[PDB]
Amino acid sequence: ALLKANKDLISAGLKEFSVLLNQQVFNDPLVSEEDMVTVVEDWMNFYINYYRQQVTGEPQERDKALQELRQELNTLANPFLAKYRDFLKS
Amino acid sequence: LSPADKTNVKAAWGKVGAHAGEYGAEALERMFLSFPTTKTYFPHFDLSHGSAQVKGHGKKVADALTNAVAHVDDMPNALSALSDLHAHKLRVDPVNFKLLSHCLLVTLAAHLPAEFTPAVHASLDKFLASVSTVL
Ligand code: HEM
Q: What is the domain extent for residue A43?
A: 1-90
Query: What is the spatial distance between Cα B5 and Cα A81, in angstroms, rounded to a whole number?
Result: 24
Quickly count: other Cβ atoms within 10 Å of residue A16's Cβ. Answer: 14
- For residue A51, the 8-state DSSP code is H
For B67, residues 6+ apart whose C-beta sits below 8 A from its C-beta are B78
Give me the number of domains chain A comprises: 1
Residue A22 CB burial class (10 angstroms; 0-12, 13-18, ≥19): exposed
Amino acid at B23: Y
**DSSP-derived secondary structure for B22-52:** GGHHHHHHHHHHH-GGGTS----TTGGG-TH
In terms of phi and psi (left: phi > 0; alpha: psi -120 to 50; beta: otherwise), the region of B66 is: alpha
* Residue B128 to residues B75, B122, B133, Cα–Cα distance (Å): 14, 10, 13
B133 within 8 A of B15, measured Cβ to Cβ: no
Q: From which experimental method does this structure derive? A: X-ray
Instruction: Determine the atom of ligand 1 nearest the C-alpha atom of B64.
Output: 10
Ordered by where they begin, the domains of chain B are 1-135 (1.10.490.10)
10 Å Cβ neighbour count for B104?
Answer: 26
Q: How many CB atoms lie within 10 A of CB B130?
A: 20
Task: Provide the Cα torsion B92, B98, B102, B108; round to 10°.
Answer: 60
Does A29 sit behind a cis peptide bond, omega within 30 degrees of 0 on the bond before it? yes
Mutation target to probe the A interface, by most A beta carbons within 10 A, among B8, B32, B126 is: B126
CATH (domain of A41): 1.20.58.420
User: DSSP state, B134?
Assistant: -
Contact B125 A17 (CB under 8 A): no
Instruction: Pick the residue from chain B with its C-alpha nearest to A38.
Output: B34
